[PDB]
RNA sequence: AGCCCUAGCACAGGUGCUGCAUGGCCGUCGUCAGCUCGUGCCGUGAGGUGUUGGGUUAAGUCCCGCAACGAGCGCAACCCCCGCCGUUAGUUGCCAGCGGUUCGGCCGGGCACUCUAACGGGACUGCCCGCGAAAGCGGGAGGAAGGAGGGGACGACGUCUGGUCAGCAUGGCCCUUACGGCCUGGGCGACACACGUGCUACAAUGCCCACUACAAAGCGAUGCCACCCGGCAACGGGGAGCUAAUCGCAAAAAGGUGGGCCCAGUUCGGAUUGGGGUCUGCAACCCGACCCCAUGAAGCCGGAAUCGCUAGUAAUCGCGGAUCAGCCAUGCCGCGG
């Protein structure tokens, strides 16, 4: 989870944004 | 506990069967402070007790426990020689702690892939009396007796 | 209606020196929208107590910026009497706005 | 990894370019390992500082993309 | 290796800051540096006066600088002479025109930084450390104090081994907040290394 | 026509307005079971009523802010009690045995320096 | 080399970046709060004197 | 005259050595219930008594006793945070109470309530029963809170010749066309190995996608960036708002509901590597983080050992800040679910 950058939770944790976690 | 005798923490009764014992069991199931999913499992297991047997899930559960409470166990004690296991009678608080504990542990060893099922079958299996929860119970009663030679210490 | 703001590190000499803008615009003036306290903004400082390696054992400092708000609803110069130059702050700041 | 320019030391090309108008020099030597290699500025032989000395590296095509310090390693015993 | 600053402890009660100027979050850094360089200047070229505290207030180019001393006359001269140079010497580098109050101390044997400062002076004069301590406390205990304490660090009497000789009478309750304990700390740049002088004077309550 | 109390619990606060009638309960422009939807312990919040037999012969408009759901539930639970005794001050000497009238002081205790987490201490190693 | 370095911490540097903070009274490179230009050390020092306005001993 | 430039002279400089020459500040036993003094009394004397004893306490806390009677540095208390209540105050908060609502607390209207923050009230062993000579221990009501209600700040005489000359200060000793100084590169980032502290995991009480105000501290006008458009995204155009209870970082995540995966080294886990990019910066080879595609490792809960924690604690899930262009933060300091 928290270490796959291509998951939403991997992004949340990393604190970043993108395809797998876009900001609305 | 060098000072006092520790007031046993009193539990907020159940939101359904209004039973303190139930909640206790729900807590032992809970993982990382997720009481919601905890109680979902226990209740959604009470549902499996119905669809399979006539009896009320509570009186299943309740009497399922009483079959997993041990009456005797062994506590170690060394001396000026070696370590020996004196069989000790088991106090009412510890009985409940242990049965409920054992229940869940026993459950999560079972094969069926869904928490609610396992809790149910195990409860059910232990009401009948054939549970692997009840093995960990007969094993201690048997692990005393085997040391019956030493029940002249007792402290 | 007139807007003045008052910041300050000192909590006592604000409610005091802005109950001075209460009275000196109450005596010589009229109706008041009283002293209302905006929340405070605390700047924390956490520092290890030692000159050298002692990563535990630290001390704790804050810099709390209390904020107090005061407005009054009679823009007359029979109020800017004391509110001309009649001063007992010391390290309070003032924001006279429209 | 950049995209507006290629950020190569200007004092390097001046040597190179004005060495590229009939210029054959091999004693060319630099401390500009930070600077990207550039199109077909091949043939030359830039000695690069590794922090201790200069390294006679001959430049081919294929390595056009890379930077100069990728050929003057800075340590010993790998 | 324990024990807090008895002053730092009290700020907010018992003791108030020696800088009562509000500022903001990119000026504070500067009105700090000035504020300080001020006291680095005073304390060097005003030592002889005998300065305890150096209050300072600000409000866009009016600066309070209320210098408390036991012998004010040495900041002045006879009429103006010196203080006239110093209100200049302040504004000299400080691009702002300064004010400059002056205060006296009704008792310099209740001024911890002085009591400590005097004790130090004795020490570069090769004095009897044990006595100096016991005197200092005695003076301060007779200037009407409720309790008082003095510490020296070490190399006492030019010795090879660092020591720590101390003395106190009456209450010096560093653990009560309503204590009002002047604290003061002097050095002592001797021929063989530094010494360190803490001074404590306790006054009262509610 | 109207009775009221303030419920709080763990940085979570509840304006609780009681009325007699029907059985409906509003929370923040939502029905109860849409806000506390599929959260088992919600029904606890109304055990004050179930004690005194006020049951659902009351309506309640409740706004609430601060905390997370299960704090609010205990907060509401406190408002319901602090309101209905402000309807009948004789409705006290029966809510004492259940103690539905106590703020519940328990809150996040402070993280301390040199720990990790308040009590959780960092890991020893000896050698 | 602390001195030639404290009088280079002030110089306007070739290239913006090479700029760094410093204790004003330490000449200290590390842990220098922007708000004060002070090392964490020389800071606990002043805050205790009282020469740091409104800075209190934080307790909660 | 001031000030700058060359040759000279005093002197600068040194993160060079000495923490066993030191100041200062920290760590440590240990928040442990202790360490002492004055006068008297005892002893040739070092010393003792006091402070031993019984009851009691978290406590040398009190009580009762006693050749002692008191006192200081300690303990506790005076301070801060959190709980309940009350005044003061209304560009944050609502029909709770009524009219318009482009149904957004948005417009008058209003501070009752929530909140923001100043000052107060409140708990003391006060009251009833029980044992006790007492202090006090077991209960019981009243009360938001009951016996230290919970959490801080606070660290006695002193020990470790503890740490630190590399924060600073300082005795001494040592270099003074170099043990000083400036730059450009390189190094502190090496890698057969070994341990500490952590992080992410080994999955079904689980992972993935979709949709859904639970809102409790902080930061931001050479910055936070709404909202637009381009872009799979990083990010780049454009541009509103707020010196900020008003605008922005803001999505809180665990959760609830829907669908999907069906026990598999897997839709578990994301290491390694190929490639193509974005951004900050003079400059990312050594040595930056971020996006996207491809690659997908070891890992199926861990020997002998051994760590933390007693309640809003442990466990678990996000959140912010300090340093800071950027970031190797999984660290540290805090916050709440």
Swiss-Prot record, chain A:
Entry annotated with the keyword RNA-binding: yes
Domain of life: Bacteria
GO annotations of cellular component type: ribonucleoprotein complex; ribosome
Basic residues bias (residue ranges): 1-12
Renumbered residue ranges of the record's region Disordered: 1-24
GO molecular function: rRNA binding
UniProt keyword terms in alphabetical order: Ribonucleoprotein, Ribosomal protein, RNA-binding, rRNA-binding
Subunit structure: Part of the 30S ribosomal subunit.
Known role: Binds at the top of the head of the 30S subunit. It stabilizes a number of different RNA elements and thus is important for subunit structure.
Protein family according to the UniProt entry: Belongs to the bacterial ribosomal protein bTHX family.
Protein's name in the database: Small ribosomal subunit protein bTHX
Gene designation per UniProt: rpsU
From Swiss-Prot, chain C:
Function (record text): Involved in the binding of tRNA to the ribosomes. Part of the top of the 30S subunit head.
Keywords: Ribonucleoprotein, Ribosomal protein, RNA-binding, rRNA-binding
Pfam families in the record: Ribosomal_S10
Known partners and oligomeric status: Part of the 30S ribosomal subunit. Forms a tight complex with proteins S3 and S14. Also contacts protein S9.
HAMAP family the UniProt entry points to: Ribosomal_uS10
Protein name: Small ribosomal subunit protein uS10
Entry's transmembrane regions: none
Gene Ontology molecular functions: rRNA binding; structural constituent of ribosome; tRNA binding
RNA-binding is among the record's keywords: yes
A cellular component annotation (GO) from this entry: ribosome
Annotated family: Belongs to the universal ribosomal protein uS10 family.
Gene name tied to this protein: rpsJ
UniProtKB/Swiss-Prot annotation, chain E:
One of the protein's GO biological processes: translation
Keyword flag rRNA-binding: yes
Alphabetical keyword list: Ribonucleoprotein, Ribosomal protein, RNA-binding, rRNA-binding
Superkingdom of the source species: Bacteria
SUPFAM superfamilies the record matches: Prokaryotic type KH domain (KH-domain type II) (SSF54814), Ribosomal protein S3 C-terminal domain (SSF54821)
A GO term, aspect molecular function: mRNA binding
Subunit relationships: Part of the 30S ribosomal subunit. Forms a tight complex with proteins S10 and S14.
UniProt cross-references to PANTHER family, sorted A to Z: 30S/40S RIBOSOMAL PROTEIN S3 (PTHR11760), SMALL RIBOSOMAL SUBUNIT PROTEIN US3C (PTHR11760:SF19)
Protein's recorded name: Small ribosomal subunit protein uS3
From Swiss-Prot, chain G:
Example of a GO MF term: rRNA binding
Listed name of the protein: Small ribosomal subunit protein uS14
PROSITE patterns for the chain: RIBOSOMAL_S14
Family annotation (HAMAP family): Ribosomal_uS14_2_B
UniProt similarity note: Belongs to the universal ribosomal protein uS14 family. Zinc-binding uS14 subfamily.
Residues that, per the record, bind Zn(2+): 23, 26, 39, 42
Cofactor note: Binds 1 zinc ion per subunit.
SUPFAM superfamilies: Glucocorticoid receptor-like (DNA-binding domain)
Quaternary structure, from the entry: Part of the 30S ribosomal subunit. Forms a tight complex with proteins S3 and S10, which cover it.
Cofactor names: Zn(2+)
Annotated GO CC locations: cytoplasm; small ribosomal subunit
Species of the source: Thermus thermophilus (strain ATCC 27634 / DSM 579 / HB8)
Gene label: rpsZ
Highest taxon of the lineage: Bacteria
Gene3D superfamilies on file: 30s Ribosomal Protein S14, Chain N
Keywords assigned: Metal-binding, Ribonucleoprotein, Ribosomal protein, RNA-binding, rRNA-binding, Zinc
